[PDB]
Amino acid sequence: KHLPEPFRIRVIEPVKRTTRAYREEAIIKSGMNPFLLDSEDVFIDLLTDSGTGAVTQSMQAAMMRGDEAFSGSRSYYALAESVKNIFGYQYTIPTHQGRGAEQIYIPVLIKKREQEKGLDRSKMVAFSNYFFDTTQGHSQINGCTVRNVYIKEAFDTGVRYDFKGNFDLEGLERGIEEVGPNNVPYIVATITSNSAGGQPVSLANLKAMYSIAKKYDIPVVMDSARFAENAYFIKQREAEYKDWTIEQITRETYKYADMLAMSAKKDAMVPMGGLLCMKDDSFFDVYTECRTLCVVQEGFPTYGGLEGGAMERLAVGLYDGMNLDWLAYRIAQVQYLVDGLEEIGVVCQQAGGHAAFVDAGKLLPHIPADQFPAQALACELYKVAGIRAVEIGSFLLGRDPKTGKQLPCPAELLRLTIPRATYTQTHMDFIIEAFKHVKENAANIKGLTFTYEPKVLRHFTAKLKEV
Amino acid sequence: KHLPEPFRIRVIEPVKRTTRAYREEAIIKSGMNPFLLDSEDVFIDLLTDSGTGAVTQSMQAAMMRGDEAFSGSRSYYALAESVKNIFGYQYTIPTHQGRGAEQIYIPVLIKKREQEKGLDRSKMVAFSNYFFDTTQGHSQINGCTVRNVYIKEAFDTGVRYDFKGNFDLEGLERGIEEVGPNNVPYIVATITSNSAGGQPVSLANLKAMYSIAKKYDIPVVMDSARFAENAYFIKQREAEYKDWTIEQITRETYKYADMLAMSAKKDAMVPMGGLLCMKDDSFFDVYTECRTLCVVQEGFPTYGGLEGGAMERLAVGLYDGMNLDWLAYRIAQVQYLVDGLEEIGVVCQQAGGHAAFVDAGKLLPHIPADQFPAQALACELYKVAGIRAVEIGSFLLGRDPKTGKQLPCPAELLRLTIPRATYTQTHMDFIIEAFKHVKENAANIKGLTFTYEPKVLRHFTAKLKEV
Amino acid sequence: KHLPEPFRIRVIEPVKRTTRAYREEAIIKSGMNPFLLDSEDVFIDLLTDSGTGAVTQSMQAAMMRGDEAFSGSRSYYALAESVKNIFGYQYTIPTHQGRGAEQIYIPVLIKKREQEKGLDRSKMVAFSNYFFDTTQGHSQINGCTVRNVYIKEAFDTGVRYDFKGNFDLEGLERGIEEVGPNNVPYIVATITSNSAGGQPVSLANLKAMYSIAKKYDIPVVMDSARFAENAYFIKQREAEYKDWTIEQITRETYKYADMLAMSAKKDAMVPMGGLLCMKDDSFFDVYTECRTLCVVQEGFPTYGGLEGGAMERLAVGLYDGMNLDWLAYRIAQVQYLVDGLEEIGVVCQQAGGHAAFVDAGKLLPHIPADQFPAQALACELYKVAGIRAVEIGSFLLGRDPKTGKQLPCPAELLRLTIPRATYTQTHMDFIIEAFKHVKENAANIKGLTFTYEPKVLRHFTAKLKEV
Amino acid sequence: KHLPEPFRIRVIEPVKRTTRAYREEAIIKSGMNPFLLDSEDVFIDLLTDSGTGAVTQSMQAAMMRGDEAFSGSRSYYALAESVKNIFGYQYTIPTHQGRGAEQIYIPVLIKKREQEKGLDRSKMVAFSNYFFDTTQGHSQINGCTVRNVYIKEAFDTGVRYDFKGNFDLEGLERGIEEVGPNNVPYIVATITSNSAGGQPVSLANLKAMYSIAKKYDIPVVMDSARFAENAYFIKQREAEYKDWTIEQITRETYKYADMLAMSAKKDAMVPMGGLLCMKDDSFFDVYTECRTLCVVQEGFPTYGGLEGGAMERLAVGLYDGMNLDWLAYRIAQVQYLVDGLEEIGVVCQQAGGHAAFVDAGKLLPHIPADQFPAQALACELYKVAGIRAVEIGSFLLGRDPKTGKQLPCPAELLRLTIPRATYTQTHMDFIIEAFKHVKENAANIKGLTFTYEPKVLRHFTAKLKEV
Ligand SMILES: [Cl-]
Ligand SMILES: [Cl-]
Ligand SMILES: [Mg+2]
Ligand SMILES: [Mg+2]
Ligand SMILES: [Mg+2]
Ligand SMILES: [Mg+2]
């Protein structure tokens, strides 16, 4: 059941209703690539939920109370105060780049253990219930290997498990033993987990994981773009916390990490901003080192930062993002879409709190993988309903940088994400209806072939035509 | 069918989800009078659609571009420019009071005809397809009698008619003849018409009405709080204008009036503001007289007026309110609610574009009229779903100012209005479900009796208890 | 000395710098009437300070947190809470019309005393240290005579007195005795007083006045558009309150009135809004009656009111308007301009906190009164520096409504008002320099004569030419 | 002469006026380091003008019209349209990091010439009339040597020259010849130039420089954080363009570069944002490569970017920043402060459009360099007037990373920068008065010594005490 909005809509962004003929011409002009479509020509944009959601009245208002001072800004103080009251963390570093300055804390933590415990850079390995792509990227760029210790139930769509994002506790222990505690720079706890489309991590699991890390004195970083949704799943599925507020669950949750890194463009409800925070004085040196590197990250002083209004807005968003009614509504809407698609026969390889990954291959079996069935489905969805989605298959995969040959892809998927507090149940039904129509006219959908192909990141600007 | 929102929600006002126990206590504290409830304790507030709807991004942004100059404000110029381009009217007077300064143009028009055609104040009569309550009030206060010349099909819920708000052309002609053209100060064309819950007026009807008025040289005022919805109904139901844009229909529509008066708090999408405009130089003296009276209305100079941002916002709202996709969506939502209620057996005495008037008497037959069955229904709807609606029955009617006895009331109705772009299909279904539940437990609902009753306007602050 | 701004400018409204030739053409097109000039063509607009000043960041932000509910709005609650904490008054009625609903409380108070003490409408007289024009207007319109009991020092520009706005305590007592206590519907305490361009009222004077009123049980209404500036003058000039905060002085000040009426467009820093408040339960019936009349003021129900954001903004403005640094700065700027003009030989008939009234007659002696020397000066000031000011002389006075002859005027004055936090010391020096230039080329300035003259309120739209 | 503001102040940020005793305690708590002071305790913050200035009404309003789409955003289109109309550049890349993605175009240009003309990375040298510190940093980090070819008059405070920021045309030619054209990856034209506190570059000089670069086919990048002020100086000092508008001068100016890089936090009037743009198709490959690197700059995909409102705001700011009246006013204010300081005997090593560098050594000769006389002056300025400025001397210089010994410093300077449209002439006079007081009590000011010193970037968080 789709819950009624626990809010009154106050400000809207008009979106024109286009004709089928118009969209047919539009998709052709864009070279059968939704990425090349004008935003105005997209009725329901499911490209991403990162920074594309709505804000509350108080959040928007906060943008006009900014203190733009270079240092000592009351807006920075307000944000740090929210972090202290919400997460219990004493040190806050606002971030305006990718994620939560992962490019910052990673090299800082590696060097810390190298100087204190003789960490060996050639043998170092970092662990996580599941590393986000960028987190894994910065780790590897820094010469650190990563391992995801997720549980057996994680990717098993056949079995139902309350916390599929949980750490494989024995796997983690085994990994540390195997690698050597001196060689483990940090452990990243991602909540909710990005495995299987987004799955929650239980507080019991986080506590157990933290005890293991503490035993070996390994820094624990909470990757928390979706800290609120994880708190909601705990309140909903972990009996012990059934009567706890989202705020209490969050305060308790963060006792089991030493610091946190997060993009504020998800649960925090803002279009820009991030955070890198440290719990207490035990990590004061890590805070100092990170703040310092933030300035000379380029190898010399460089200044930048969120405008005052943005810090005031995030200071409010951290609270509004934890609203119980809101969280129940947001999650119920995502589940409503997934359940609706399943009902009409649409199959997803994985579907969770973050996104649904429709199997375009099964939906359009007559199309060869090399002809990008998921990109064709994306185009068809646009033609039929003006929906824009992202292909996660051979098209995205690209070619071998050394052979120029198409890389092999396990499955041709079409990703559906939902911007927060942006679309309604009617839009969800509109999407479901669109897939029902596509499924019905599947055999008639054509494969694609390049008319223009960039050497790198081809999915963003490549142009194709029907076969 | 409820259409999908032709927009992306951008700003929301959080509303808490309350428990039944909480609402039970709340309604008691408010003395079984929703008017006394805190807005925060109301989940779906259907009290009124006047100034309670959402605004577009451009409209909200306009509030920050205000020119606060006492005279010659570029913001005033922008608003007048919108009126000139949209309605074709050369003279604009922004209003910030009730409706569109009806308290202004009425005395001005009466005096005009009195001086030019020897109008007799003791015999004067004003006509309209249907006078809004306030319009009728200012007319009568000024000593002018009013007559509503609506068509036979107007209040006949048994027959379907495309334009139930139409003028009874022969009735108007007959009335003028009867009263004497010199004694008819003005004719007010209300669009959409407030008869039968809101019904459209055809352009063919307006043209015919204007020819009659022109023949007798009688000023025609377009009461247009809902000018856009009327334009939409014309595009939808009047074949001649099927392919015309809302803008073209509006420009054409206003050729058939000499001036316009409107509250901008409906179709114009703003929380405050109104307009009093004159088409061309033929009414320049009426414009001058109105502007003058605006200043010395109290019998001496008094200054006030919309802030610059409000005029800039309205200048934009007049355009956004005419968006075709928006209008189709808004109207479809209203019809969706009505159709849904009819389906579950809920009966309305009248239902149209403005509101739905549920018959509380038929829904709760065991409750005596004197015990206010519509007020009881209002309370029950709040208890069950946190919905706030307004009683239009014996409670509102009140007592005889000369006898202190309850006045006789034709029907006990509960009014449902829908704030623009504020609630979703899910809320509409929530409302329908609430009525379904009430209908099922009807026999158990109790009547009400006063515990506190004001001498005047008792419906706003009276307190009652169950019998 | 002009104090430095106790604030950082955050948002500006661009104003173009025009050439002398451009302004010469502009003033001609406007018929030698600044009222007819476009705001954009005015560099320094000294027309009025009513709703033309700047707002603080928090005030502007508040506009986006509005609760538009018809009743029970949290925004209304926030405003009432500010009034309760600032003035100590328990009942609040937001106003959106002229001043503070003087058209409301006056008839309510007259009727109250008529029913309770047999007040005689044919003999009733209201008192005030000095009635504002509109206040006097509503009193007289209601058939009530008014008397200003100001002190001897009030209009004496030759003597310096700390509180020229003080009530003539013995005069008030004598007046009540003379008129009869049953016939005195109310006493209005205006702070700061509008006499002599704006003069403060001491707390000692207000206390003494209230004791007199209390003795005769006569309602006291505090007309407080400039309550903050009065509080500042008390802190500056009344020794007893030297170390009290503006907030403490204000709380104490309002113990000496039973209710308050104020336009929020002055000290409260907003472009729109007003207030009508009652101190405690002793005036609950007056509150109820006023709220009721607010609805049926037209003789029937009419709905209107400030939008939610406006109430939230005023809730903040009442506090920001009391900022000590701000008040000292605002007042010092006004005094800076006056002192500067005096230094160059410019003479004012009166000058105070509200405005400076330059004597155009003395500055331009060669121009006959009937040729409007103050209107000529206004035009010259615009030609020379792009300054717009308002004439308060024969031009404004107009003709005898019964003789059509020019009415006799005591002096030809040009009013200078200063919008709050809008202009700088540089603008003040620019204004002073402009007058210095005018004084130097005075003999060459020409008188004016009509080319177009309205029958009423001619000063607003009349057009003239040079003689 | 300080010009009057060509604008009306509309929104203000309150700043409290502190007592001397309060500031004395505050500066001690901050360890005699203004960087550690709360913004609220700073009356006049001259720390930096980067993103600390005011915005216009239209700019602020634009923040509410954002299109947050990941791709095809109408807000991105609006910004690109402004760039095309203002600079004539067809390709736009919005930046949200440091400056204008210098970390992006530098490696792209180096690789371009390496592949096309066999550039030798071990011999490459980049030229500029004067490289900004960050620009020089990214160049060197990329292994590229830099040379500043400024003119002899540049740093000569004894001689007056209209365009001290000019390229040393013969020096540039000689340098390219010396280095070898194949080894010169790019030439950066900084406008206005950061040499000698900010000095303009003439259009004649830019044209001559571009002809030289074009002759050798060397890419020219316009570093234009202050493009508007440079245009203003050209209109003021370069006779040929005396009657040209700032817009025309800017369009002409950019014909002499192939691309532009700029922080929008200066002349563009925004608190955040930057730009990296390419003129035409000749640089389409450079645009494509830069956009690509923008995504995989970390060595893998990372997503981030300005929120829609920020792009809409910058789209407006580029225009408002070119307002002629505004530019004349801004520059006149800076010159007013400098002239005022010179008048009272304060000496600056250099002073220009960007900042004034007061010689603390000469002002406080009794203080040893190692005791940081400029940091002492900064503290004294705060104690006396609540002014916060930045030390540019031994304190900032720091210690030798290899010896731990204090590094030798040429002069002990105190930098004064002025946030745009933030402070008034009164604040400028307040600053001048403060220096007059310091100069008078100079002998009594004490030197400083560390109580806490970080290993790196000590100037930001170090704490000291008086000697
Ligand atoms: Cl706020
Ligand atoms: Cl806008
Ligand atoms: Mg900043
Ligand atoms: Mg106004
Ligand atoms: Mg309202
Ligand atoms: Mg974004």
Author numbering:
A (entry chain A), B (entry chain A), C (entry chain A), D (entry chain A): 5 to 471
Provide passages from the article that reported this PDB entry.
E. coli tryptophanase (tryptophan indole-lyase, Trpase, EC 4.1.99.1) is a pyridoxal 5'-phosphate (PLP)-dependent enzyme that catalyses α,β-elimination and β-replacement reactions of L-tryptophan. Trpase consists of four identical subunits (~52 kD per monomer), each of which covalently binds one molecule of PLP. The tetramer possesses a D2 symmetry, therefore it is a dimer of dimers with two different dimeric interfaces: a catalytic interface and a non-catalytic interface. Using kinetic spectrophotometric methods and size-exclusion chromatography we have previously shown that the inactivation process is linked to the cleavage of the PLP-Lys270 aldimine bond and to the dissociation of the tetrameric form of Trpase into dimers.
The two apo mutants of E. coli Trpases as well as the wt Trpase are found in an open conformation, different than that of the closed one found for P. vulgaris in its holo form. In the Y74F mutant, the observed loss of activity at 25°C is presumably attributed to the proximity of residue 74 to the substrate binding site. In the wt Trpase the hydroxyl group of Tyr74 is hydrogen bonded to both Arg103 (at a 2.9 Å distance), and to the phosphate group of PLP (of the neighbouring subunit in the catalytic dimer) through a bridging water molecule. Replacing Y74 by phenylalanine eliminated the hydrogen bonds of the hydroxyl group thereby reducing its affinity towards PLP. Hence, the Y74F mutant exhibited negligible activity compared to the other Trpases. The Y74F mutant has low activity at 25°C and its residual activity was further reduced by cooling. It should be noted that mutant Y74F dissociates even at 25°C (about 17%). The catalytic dimer (AB) is further stabilized by two hydrogen bonds between the hydroxyl groups of Tyr74 and Tyr307 from one subunit to the phosphate group of the PLP molecule from the neighboring subunit.
